[PDB]
Amino acid sequence: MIQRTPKIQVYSRHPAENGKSNFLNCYVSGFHPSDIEVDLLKNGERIEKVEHSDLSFSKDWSFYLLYYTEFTPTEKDEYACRVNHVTLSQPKIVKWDRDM
Amino acid sequence: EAAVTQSPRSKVAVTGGKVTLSCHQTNNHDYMYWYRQDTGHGLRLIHYSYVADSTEKGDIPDGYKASRPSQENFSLILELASLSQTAVYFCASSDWVSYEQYFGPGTRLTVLEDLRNVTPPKVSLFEPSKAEIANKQKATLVCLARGFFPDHVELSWWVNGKEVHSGVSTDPQAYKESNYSYALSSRLRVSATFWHNPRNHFRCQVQFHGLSEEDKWPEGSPKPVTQNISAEAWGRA
Amino acid sequence: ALWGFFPVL
Amino acid sequence: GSHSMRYFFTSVSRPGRGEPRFIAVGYVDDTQFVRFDSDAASQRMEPRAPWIEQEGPEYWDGETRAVKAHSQTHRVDLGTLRGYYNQSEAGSHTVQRMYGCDVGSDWRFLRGYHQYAYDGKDYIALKEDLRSWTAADMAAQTTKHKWEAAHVAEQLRAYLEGTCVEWLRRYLENGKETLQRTDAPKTHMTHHAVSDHEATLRCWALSFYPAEITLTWQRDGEDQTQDTELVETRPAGDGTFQKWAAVVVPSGQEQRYTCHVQHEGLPKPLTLRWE
Amino acid sequence: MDSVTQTEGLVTLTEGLPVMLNCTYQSTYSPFLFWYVQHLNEAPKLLLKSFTDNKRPEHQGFHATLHKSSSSFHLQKSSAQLSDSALYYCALFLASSSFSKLVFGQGTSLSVVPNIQNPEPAVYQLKDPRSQDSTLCLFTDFDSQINVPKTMESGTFITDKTVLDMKAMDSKSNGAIAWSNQTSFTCQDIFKET
């Protein structure tokens, strides 16, 4: 079997602006096999209403998924994405950065 | 070899009665089909199945319902039988290569408004002409089945207790002389020396397929069930 | 639209 | 200009459960329009684009019974492949399938695809001539002999050169406001000092369609790719896409570097420099 | 669309002559055609495929060449033999539907007749001993190129010609049988007019 480590990207749909509603995206790609756990976090706490895109793959047979939830960005609140895979020994956490 | 079986091979039903046609297949195929044939022409798809417990509609699904309980069996069910459903039903089977289909033996089904019209044949054996024997040195015995309704018959010749296929010509189609009665004939030709022998016993057997034991029938008339009717004649010097 | 023929491996 | 139709099939065997997982998705270019999940409640083909909803019940009932057969085929394929490679039933395995067609700027057939993958590795693929098969191993040869005897490639060509193309043309017309559009990327450059002697220059490209884009970094008019960080093109979630490229740059030498953005909806390739 | 058109009705051919059964079709995309043979009291079975090469496929013998330009797939054979007497179906395997299936035509009945070298046409009268005044007329040993008369009178019924073969040596003979409900009859006039 061939095992590939996931590539995690945490970002917003539109340029982040405080007080105005947006969508928080976590895009996992280039992973194999398809079995994966992805949770979106708000200050370390798991967000309930998180919807994911339907499973698809690239030309090199690498899988990709889009996890998203509607949120209102603000100064003091932190957002992150927690991803677990068979290649990963522990659930990896990547924090969202708007200033990147 | 891929073999498909059907049951029953012959069925007589009433208008507005439930009819079930079974199909067994032991070839490990996923795809099974139900076709119908009308007067020796056309083969139209009714229902089909690609997997167990799932059935798909074919070209002409109206008045028909189907069931696939397992991979081996695929049933065709008629809830309300109509006059237009009188046909010869074939069951097909194939794998993913769905263009090579293996068919079953077939099922003749006739639906009638009334049951009284069903009647057994009257088999009469006609003896050869002496003008034929003295000129061609051959004798032609002709069998004649008359006055039978549903044309679900099978004719067989019997010489000296054995079923013969030598010098036999049965009619491919049953000739319709009246609306509620069919006719069928066959020829048996043997040598002059064979016919003139008193030992030789000739017999024409007609296997008539009629009603089953589960069918209701009035007390007066005898029930026209599946029966064999024969006529016989012996050799004359 | 999907392909109407389904070949197995 | 050039468009495509794609169907992605994923079947994963689950030893811990009763039934294997099957997921099937349809794409026109970079927009998803149909889906099917074996663990979904409906057990039917589901619309994902607005423009596919204008199809009648004839289409949906036909596509439902087709994908169910696709699901049934790949369930058997899982068992057939485990027998080919002599593998136990305790282990999970993934079968990936992809087929589709490409059209040019004139909406005419260019390329056709039909390929499989087992556990990530290539298995069997239809060649560019649409008559030939590429078998990766000896187990793939058994499949190749099955399809050549049944003339599957000839049956496949009728779909790829005909049905795939003519339905793709139908989708492009029905979704003219969505699929035939072209969005130009909004571009800006961000700067971050990583150390007392180095700094990162990021070249952003936001809100563009289609996903196909080129981002290249140049130092003194020469393509630098040996020291470039490039991320996978990501969807925004509304139909548009996003991508960036970063380079490690010595402090004070930020203006010696340039980013170049190439896009179909962009009249001229843009040059970006830090100021 | 998606149709098959065959030669309508019965095709009568003498043994030794080449077989020709027509099949035209309507199709949306590049299709494939098949011939299905059904003998009397037997299951329909696949005869030949359209593959293989540019139009030409075929087994037993029987062969067919596919012409995509005019959409033709006619069944052919060099020399017909008595065993070819069967119903022939031309089928179109759907090139591109939601589900691929075979579309059968109306079917063409082939009836290959024997070449009688020494014909001896004769009419005989036969009796049923168990019943009174019941009679039958038999017409036998005639050429395969003459017409057997059909019924025009009520009560009198005539059957189509059939062939019997004895296990002696090629004693193949055509035969027609007729009977009437009337008392007054003549076997000398019933088999009149080819």
User: Which residues on chain D are in Cβ contact (under 8 Å) with A4?
Assistant: 120
Distance CA D178, CA D170 (A): 13
Tally: H helices and E strands in chain C = 0, 0
Q: Does domain B114-237 fall into CATH 3.30.300.30?
A: no
Q: H-helix or E-strand containing D186?
A: strand D186-193
Question: Domain containing A18 — which CATH number?
Answer: 2.60.40.10
Residue B54 bridge partners (DSSP): B51
Do D54 and D188 share a domain, yes or no?
no
Is position D8 within any domain? Answer: yes
- Round to whole Å and give the CA distance between B182 and B208: 12
Contact call for residues D46 and D39 (beta carbons, < 8 A) = no
If asked whether residues D15 and D128 sit together in one domain, one would say yes
What is the C-alpha to C-alpha distance for residues D122 and D120, in angstroms, rounded to an integer? 7
Instruction: Please say whether the beta carbons of B160 and B200 come within 8 A.
Output: yes
In this complex, do D66 and C9 lie within 8 Å of one another by their Cβ atoms? no
Q: With contact defined as beta carbons under 8 Å apart, do B147 and B179 qualify?
A: no
Within 10 Å of residue B169's Cβ, how many Cβ atoms? Answer: 22
Interface size B-E, in CB pairs within 8 Å, comes to: 122
Residue after which a domain boundary falls, among D181, D201, D233: D181
CATH of the domain at D249: 2.60.40.10
CB B198 within 8 A of CB E182: no
CB B227 within 8 A of CB B118: no
Instruction: Measure B97 CA to nearest chain D CA, in Å.
Output: 7
Smallest Cβ distance to D7: which of C2, C5, C6? C2
Terminal-residue alpha carbon distance, chain B: 50
Whole-angstrom Cα distance, residue D66 to residue A11?
Answer: 37
CB-nearest partner of D65 from B56, B96, B97: B56
Distance CA B94, CA B99 (A): 8
Cβ-based neighbours of B125, under 8 Å, separated by 6 or more: B141, B142, B143, B144, B202, B204, B231, B232, B233, E128, E130
Considering only CB atoms, D237 lies closest to which of A2, A13, A63, namely: A13
Strand partners of residue E6: E23
Inter-axis angle of helices D138-149 and D57-84, to 10 degrees?
140
- Which residue from A88, A96, A97, A89 is spatially nearest to A41, judged by alpha carbons? A96
Q: Which subunits have 3 or more CB–CB pairs within 8 Å of chain E?
A: B, C, D
DSSP 8-class letter at E82: G
Question: Max CA-CA distance within chain C?
Answer: 22
- Provide CB contacts within 8 A for D218, sequence distance 6+: D224, D257, D258, D259, D260
Q: For residue C3, what are its two tokens? A: 């392909």
Q: Which residues constitute the domain of residue A27? A: 1-100
Number of helical (H) and strand (E) elements in chain D, helices listed first: 5, 17
Chains B and A touch (3+ CB pairs under 8 A): no
On the 0-12 / 13-18 / 19+ scale of CB atoms within 10 A, E112 is buried
D127 shares a domain with D94 = yes
Q: Are residues D107 and D64 in the same domain?
A: yes
DSSP string of D237-248? SSS-EEEEEEEE
Q: Are A53 and A27 a contacting pair, CB within 8 Å?
A: no
CA torsion, points E13, E19, E22, E23, in degrees to nearest 10? 130
B71 burial (CB, 10 Å; 0-12 / 13-18 / 19+) is middle
Distance between CA atoms of D130 and D160, rounded to whole angstroms?
9
Whole-angstrom distance, CA of residue D236 vs CA of residue D233: 10
Number of domains, chain A: 1
Domains detected in chain E: 2-114 (2.60.40.10), 115-194 (2.60.40.10)
**Tokens at E60, concatenated:** 């037993």
Q: Using DSSP, how many helices (H) and how many strands (E) does chain E show?
A: 1, 16
Q: Which domain covers residue D245, as residue numbers?
A: 182-270
Q: Does D158 share its domain with D79?
A: yes
Q: Distance between the two ends of chain A, CA-based, in angstroms?
A: 36
Cross-chain Cβ contact E51/D154 below 8 Å: yes
Is residue D221 within 8 A of residue D229, CB to CB? The reply is: no
Decide if D65 contacts E98 (C-beta within 8 A): yes
Q: Are strands B107-112 and B10-14 parallel, antiparallel or unpaired?
A: parallel
Distance of alpha carbon D62 from its chain centroid, rounded?
A: 24
Token duo for residue D226? 């040996």
Which H or E element spans position B192?
helix B192-195
Q: Pick the last residue of a domain from D154, D181, D208.
A: D181
Q: Tell me, yes or no, whether D141 and D193 share the same domain.
A: no
For residues A28 and A6, the answer to whether their CB atoms sit within 8 Å is yes
Amino acid making up residue E52: T
User: How many Å apart are CA D141 and CA D134, to the nearest integer?
Assistant: 9
Do D59 and D115 fall into the same domain?
yes
Q: Give burial (CB, 10 Å; 0-12/13-18/19+) of A36.
A: buried
| CATH number of the domain bearing residue D75 | 3.30.500.10
Q: How many residues does chain B have?
A: 237
- Which of C2, C3, C5 to probe the E interface (max E CBs under 10 A)? C5
D12-40 CB burial, b ≥16 within 10 A, e <16 = bbeeeeeebbbbbbbbbbbbbbbbbbbee
Whole-number Å distance between alpha carbons of B41 and B45: 13
Residue B131: enclosing H or E segment and its boundaries? helix B130-136
**Which residue stretches of chain D are H helix?**
57-84, 138-149, 152-158, 164-174, 176-179
CB contacts, 8 Å: D170 with chain E: none
> How is residue D141 written in tokens?
């040869």
Task: Check if the beta carbon of residue E126 is closer than 8 Å to that of residue B61.
Answer: no
Please tell me the number of Cα atoms within 13 Å of E15 on its side-chain side: 13
E67-82 residues labelled b (16+ CB within 10 A) or e (exposed): eeeebbbbbebeebee
Contacts of A76 (CB under 8 A, 6+ apart): none
CB atoms within 10 A of CB D233: 20
Rounded Cα–Cα distance for residues A65 and A60 (Å): 15
Window 37-66 of E: residues touching B by CB (8 A cutoff) are 40, 43-46, 49
Q: Tokens in use for D203?
A: 């070249």
Question: Do D152 and D25 fall into the same domain?
Answer: yes
Q: Are B111 and B81 in contact (CB under 8 A)?
A: yes
d(CA A56, CA D215): 24
Which residues in chain E have Cβ-Cβ distances shorter than 8 Å to D149?
A: none
Residue with the two structure tokens 């590539």: A7
CA dist D125 and D133 (Å) reads 6
Structure-token match 């003896």, residue found:
B127
* Token pair 């168990």: residue: E130
d(CA E188, CA D71): 72
Resolution of the PDB structure in angstroms? 2.9
Do the Cβ atoms of B149 and B182 come closer than 8 Å?
yes
Backbone angles phi and psi of D141, in degrees to 5? -65, -35
Closest by alpha carbon to A54, among D40, D152, E104, D128?
D40
Other C-beta atoms lying within 10 Å of the C-beta of residue E14: 13
Contact criterion met (CB below 8 Å) for E190 and E137: yes
Rounded to 5, what percent of chain D is helix, strand, coil?
25, 40, 35
Q: At E162, phi and psi to the nearest 5?
A: -130, 160
- Asked if residue D275 belongs to a domain, the reply is no
Using CA atoms, how far apart are residues B118 and D193, in angstroms rounded to an integer?
101
Residue among B31, B140, D93 nearest A34 (CA): D93
Give the 3-state secondary structure of residue B184. strand
**B1-22 burial, b for 16+ CB within 10 Å, e for fewer?**
eeebebeeebbbbbeeeebebe
Q: Distance, in angstroms, between B94 CA and closest chain C CA? A: 12
What residue ranges in chain E does DSSP mark as E strands?
3-6, 10-14, 19-21, 23-26, 32-38, 45-49, 63-64, 75-77, 86-93, 102-104, 108-113, 122-127, 135-140, 157-158, 162-164, 173-179
Q: Per-residue DSSP letters for D195-222?
A: SSSEEEEEEEEEEEBSS--EEEEEETTE
CA E127, distance to chain mean position in Å, is 32
D190 shares a domain with D177: no
Q: In this structure, are strands E157-158 and E135-140 parallel, antiparallel, or unpaired?
A: unpaired
**DSSP 8-state secondary structure symbol assigned to residue E84:** G
Tell me whether domains B3-113 and B114-237 share a fold: yes
From the CA of E18, how many Å to the nearest CA of chain B?
Answer: 23
Three-class secondary structure assignment of B135-160: HHCEEEEEEEEEEECCCCEEEEEEEC
Coil, strand or helix at D72: helix
Helix (H, G, I), strand (E, B) or coil at A71: strand
Query: D96 and D31 in one domain?
Result: yes
Say yes or no for a CB contact (<8 Å) between D12 and A68.
Answer: no
| Domains of chain D: total | 2
Phi/psi at D146 (nearest 5 deg)?
-70, -40
Residue type, B190: V
Write out chain C residues lying below 8 Å of B96, CB-based. Answer: 6-8
Residues D124, D3 within the same domain: yes
Strand order in B227-234's β-sheet? B162-164, B153-159, B201-208, B227-234
- ∠ CA(B180), CA(B185), CA(B187), 5° rounding? 180
DSSP A55: P
- The tokens describing D70, both together, are 């696709």
Query: Is the residue at D225 inside a domain?
Result: yes
B3-113 CATH: 2.60.40.10
Neighbouring-strand partners of residue A18: none
Q: Which residues of B touch C7 (CB under 8 A)?
A: 96
Can you tell me which residue has the tokens 């996931």? A6
Residue spans of the domains in chain B: they are 3-113, 114-237
Q: Report the DSSP beta bridge partners of residue D48.
A: none
**Pairwise CA distance, residues A57 & A76, whole Å:** 37
Strands E32-38 and E45-49: antiparallel
What are the backbone angles phi and psi of residue B84, rounded to the nearest 5°?
-75, -10
With contact defined as beta carbons under 8 Å apart, do A38 and A65 qualify?
yes
Residues 6+ apart with CB under 8 A from E10: E109, E111
**Alpha carbon distance, N-terminus to C-terminus of chain E:** 42
Closest residue of chain B to C6, computed from CA coordinates:
B96
State whether residue D80 sits within 8 Å of chain B by CB: no
Residues D57 and D108 in one domain: yes
